[PDB]
Symmetry: D2
Subunit: 461 residues, 4 copies
């Protein structure tokens, strides 16, 4: 009877449900919250606009929010990241979802718009859950009136947080936000170990290439680049790392990687002469992890070893100059989300040409495009943080507060450490791990409560 959705194939729903039932068993923090808060219905009356990869893991998040009282309207934040069986299962449960794997850019924008509008008019949304900031931007630029009713935004990822902080600095942010990314059980779990799991996964599914013994260049060594570099090194790749941040570069050196630049002496003057052609001519795989623009540029692409794989695991595709490749080189689809890019010219290629690159997911997030992103047991931490953040901001009721109280509360904050610890404890118990309890004397000795928090807010883990 329910028709308020658009997915690839509703008949995938039973398969999706089987996978959701398995995922629930892999997500003890999130399911623990579901069990803890079900009675109290802390999200009763919440109307959440959600924009995040419509995977199985996101399904467990959505059904947790609903189980706690929320209504939601959902879209994916990437054209290739949906798992169609997950979308089907959510739609089959009577939840509005607009998402499929392999959207066009026009379809992507349309799906976000279907969450925002219900029956042609703005939905009475009062909460936002976002990954990367596209939904947040559309609301501020095109639907500013809807933000008058919204209590908060809970933002998943580093890039989205940057965008929020810029808005706050400029006075254009209209509702408070929680930076979910910077929970330790998000940033130092999902961003790092998630990519460790899923980068090599995606490259194998796309190419079935042996990785051992081959040369990789990882651009960036933040949380994603750390995890990515390990994904490849643990397979036996000879990994080199590029960075602009000398502290992150120091970490790469100490971690056993050679730190190099694509450019002579690190200076990117925009000319072919600046490219270290000797270095790039030996690289079999380049992975971008930065959240920055044009870190695998046209001249680097021209210089790469024949038959190198090129992919991006940062949030947005402009890390690699794919526009240059579309303008100048011929694309041969191997299979979905795997293209050979023939450097011999624009139109026409020889089927047996040797001078090509392999691009994964058209430069979009490769882990989600060519595989299934992070595994449930890792996403458990990120998504338990999301639920806690939604509860906190919904309960604070920003949209209803007096102006002076709003002025005090308009901020981008993180969750308290106590809650980060509580999420982590459930994760550890999920592994069968046992956390020791401090004695009262030990807790006094190091100056903490037996119940935590166990570290000062300055601590970096």
């Amino acid at each position: 009877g329910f028709t308020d959705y658009k997915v690839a194939d509703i008949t995938l729903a039973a398969w999706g449900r089987r996978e959701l039932i398995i995922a629930e068993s892999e997500m003890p923090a999130l399911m623990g919250l579901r069990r803890k808060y079900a009675g109290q219905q802390p999200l009763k009356g919440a109307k959440i606009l959600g924009c995040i990869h419509m995977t199985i893991q996101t399904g467990v998040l959505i059904e947790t929010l609903v189980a706690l009282g929320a209504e939601v309207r959902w879209s994916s934040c990437n054209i290739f990241s949906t798992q169609d069986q997950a979308a089907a299962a959510i739609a089959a449960a009577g939840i509005p979802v607009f998402a499929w794997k392999g959207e066009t850019e026009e379809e992507y924008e349309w799906c976000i718009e279907q969450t925002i509008l219900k029956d042609g008019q703005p939905w009475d949304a009062n909460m936002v859950l976002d990954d990367g900031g596209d939904l947040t931007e559309i609301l501020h630029k095109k639907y500013p009136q809807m933000l008058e009713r919204i209590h908060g935004i809970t933002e998943e990822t580093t890039t989205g947080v940057h965008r929020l902080l810029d808005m706050l600095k400029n006075g254009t942010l209209k509702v408070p936000a929680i930076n979910v990314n910077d929970s330790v059980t998000k940033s130092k779990n999902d961003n790092k170990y998630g990519c460790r799991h899923s980068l090599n996964d995606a490259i194998k599914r796309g190419t079935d290439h042996l990785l051992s013994g081959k040369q990789a260049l990882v651009i960036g060594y933040g949380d994603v680049g750390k995890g990515s570099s390990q994904s490849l090194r643990q397979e036996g790749m000879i990994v080199k790392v590029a960075e602009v941040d000398p502290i992150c570069a120091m970490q790469a050196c100490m971690d056993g990687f050679e730190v190099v630049s694509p450019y002579k002496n690190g200076i990117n003057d925009g000319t072919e002469a600046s490219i270290d052609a000797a270095l790039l001519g030996k690289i079999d795989l380049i992975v971008t992890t930065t959240g920055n623009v044009n870190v695998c540029d046209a001249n680097m692409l021209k210089a790469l070893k024949k038959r190198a794989v090129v992919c991006n695991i940062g949030h947005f595709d402009n890390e690699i100059d794919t526009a240059f490749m579309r303008k100048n080189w011929a694309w041969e689809e191997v299979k979905p989300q795997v293209h050979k890019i023939h450097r011999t010219g624009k139109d026409g290629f020889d089927a047996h040409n040797d001078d090509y690159l392999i691009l994964l997911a058209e430069g979009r997030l490769v882990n989600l495009g060519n595989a299934t992103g992070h595994p449930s047991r890792i996403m458990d931490g990120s998504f338990a943080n999301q639920v806690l953040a939604q509860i906190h901001l919904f309960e604070q009721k920003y949209a209803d507060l007096p102006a002076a109280e709003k002025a005090k509360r308009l901020s981008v904050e993180v969750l308290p450490k106590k809650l980060d610890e509580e999420v982590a404890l459930e994760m550890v118990k999920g592994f069968g791990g046992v956390v020791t309890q401090l004695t009262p004397k030990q807790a006094e000795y190091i100056g903490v409560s037996v119940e935590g928090p166990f570290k000062p807010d300055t601590y970096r883990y």
Copy 2:
């Protein structure tokens, strides 16, 4: 020159040979020498220093002096001095009071020799400390000296805790820099230094194969992380204990099984609480916490026969060695290696099978049984120390009026720009090449091309 006490002054030439090698391994620190030599930013500084008198500390001391400082130096541990390093410093005409194998009485005497010159308080105006013993003695016994001191630069996590307690209680008299929490210290020294030096010390003390054996690491902060890797990389099967669930989550994700010595994780002080099956399979226990009694008497009783026991946290009370001294017979194998015979206190059978091996009498094992962290890692810590000394000395806290002092009294870290400057020199030391952002890229992510590259919230 006679204003020193070392084991053997004739070791000085050997020490100098090692200092010359260490300088080549310490580009950040040597770079500071070249950068600041002309300006002499520490001219007039009189620094009381208390930190492990190793070759690495030698290069630190000579850097401070090269920048204009005078110093008076002691070690912060009874077993951590390298006698050739101490000799070389004494031979350069610098007051140093330090040798490997001090008694506790000698340790206290050496600190006192830095504080006093010719029987009266030295006109000290700066403090460099590792662990807080010198800082405590100044506050408790020589409070008048703190009236002239511009600041304290503290090396290690335990010392920082002690400073923060003072600040909370309003008893801290001078500002401090928490040198530990530079990323180029905490996430370099504490982690990778222990990775290098823990397995080193265990091999020197015992020459035991580590591969295939079972280890329990107590703690998974920076030292526990590095320690766990030191052992895992050798092929140990490592289990980790933690009180902090976030650190425990990291251990799980890093590929370790997380266990408690105690049933249900509850340390009720009884033998019944001990997981005897677990402890009876452990070949090596390492404490990394900065806490007290984390390898306790009941754990020691339950350990597998012939297990090795050591501590790499700052102080020896991590292990209940007092219990062992009271109850069990100690057989010295060689210096800093004892068999502890669990058969009783009154002698031992030379062929007894029921013993534990304790390294460095439970004191910092990396420094006690080997040489601590390597020069290229200490480069980062000690470049931060020099910069911290400069920062606080230049700010001249001791010259402000009391109301202005009250506003300026803090425990702070160095600014990120300086942490980055140290890191860059470390990276160039490896032959690493850092990429420069284009103006468009710097705009895109909202940073200067010169840095800093991360918000102060960033955890690396």
Copy 3:
């Protein structure tokens, strides 16, 4: 052309795109293709082939054809075919009978379609086999065909065992080359292939996080070595079981804890013999043995709820799946992934917590749930296959007098010189540069500058 049966011929263009990529990843095999094209050493060869119909096997098949052979092909496992590879081979005019998800009846039919052409035995004169099923069918059901066959080239450990048993019993009718025991096969494919593809298949089937979880690997031969590394490198806590103490020693030294499913290692057939405490903590069990019932009914009953069970040895009887079919309810998650509900046979609760996850119905998991070994590894195995086909075809066993046959009826390996030549091409494929001995150095160690470099005793 209609002499084939595949899932979907329209997948052929996709398969060809992947073959063109695979050729670039297989320098040893494509080097042989180019080298022997002129000579046509397999002109007149009529090869019955039974081996997983993957993209890699496609490159092998097209190499044999390029060297003059005709072939008729089937897969040696019901789940191992890549349908696009089969399509591409069929589209090239080569008889192939293979698809992913065959029934056992279909599997036997496909082998029979290779053996028969137009309802009568094909005039086969060569056999290429993986695991021995084709070899067995010829000996048992078509013995007259073996009168014309010059040899068998056998890919895998299990098939070689079966050949050696036949030879011992006097029932082997044609000579064979053990391709498995080239170093560029056994110590490449069996080990590093499983390192690549075991974790691959578990991720594709389950998308389970592996880091931090407990695995038990049964066996520590070449496949168990590679499998254990596949899991450990992901951060699993891996325990290893073995019956061979030398292999167990290697596991210990490699950093694994060596355990038995049975108390004191004694499998008496009772539940009381099972180490239920150990098995109750295992999240993943992988069988690697080539043996029977190494993950038995009582082990399955004892495993932790929701454990994954899989087999990467050649045949499914490593795990007692027959017990599971008789007693427990199977819920298909998706193809080649079943939840096995331990609550009973007659239906299951969709929300039951007491289940195991079985991959590929206990068949070779790397090929069943992923794509098996990668091209650049299969390059070594399949270069050896081509060399072995050439050698046995050129020897012409079927034509020799009885006394000469008697001398030649054996199971042999390829010479070390050829193993080295394959390896050299593999190394150059990575961009590796092998040093050439000087004449003095070659004299010093007693080898030719060209090799072979090691005595036949050498184990690598």
Copy 4:
């Protein structure tokens, strides 16, 4: 008792304490000691022994004696003796001629003291050798003594090569057991021993950080495999050179870049052939080959300033140290650590930057700068030694009829069943539990339930 020469007999108590610990780490060897003590299988054996006089060798010597043998012992390297081990052996009344830091003349004298007792040949009837120097001296200088010798048991790869050359040339006078090629020797000692002890020795000699730096390992046999892992596990970026393409393939698959010191691998003897760009980035070079001049004069000229150079193959001629002695100035840092100044022969500037660091004067670095392999690894090697001595002594070659001698003049290995029995004791030492086959399983794979478990072709 005076029939010995050691550095310092007063080290004996320390040595004994370490022997008591080593016995607890050597369960295979101590198991043989317990098993065979009653039967005294070496009663009447008079063994000339030449092998590194370490604590581990002490346990071997005392096992041979405990089984009835008399021995006369020397070290097979000038730097490998542990003086406390030598002292303890001498203090037990066993003839030993060994100290750390022998001259070449002293080394030859020590071997001669084993051969002669009171100025005339000892009535030796057995030889235990490591590297072949003793074996060579007997054949060249004391051939009459070989008439009464029943056999030689040879520890190491280089010594085995020398024996096989003798056999090929018809100059070998007594049979030998190649102890090296037991799996519990070659694939334990040669590989995992160097994994343990290479990084150990480099740390003790230099205290250099290894993580992040560039290494070149020359060779990828058993020692090169273990060596490469020693460095990679510390975080070095390791490149590997090889002449054997199969070993090079393994290095690639193991995650190393395979390179040559020479452009395109061609060593034409000129400076122009050296890849100066590659060598100018290497911080550490380690030779592992058993070959000559694999780190040659031109390579040494091209290495990065301040690179460490060492050898872990049996003999020092792997590195052209003679070139360095002729041309460059040596500055001793401390024992077994020299800076070699490339500025000229006649003196050096103490602050010169253009030097290399050579460890142990190019002699076996693990034994020279540390203590070699750990007891628990040497357990396997030395259990094999004891078994080999028993076998050859019981065979009584010297006393056999000539036709039987002709058949038995050979170089053989120990049976696989005994290799397995050694391994089982090693595994139990770790607390490992080996599973026992059921009768049906043993039938299925074609072995006895008690083993042996693999055919003699198996490479592990």
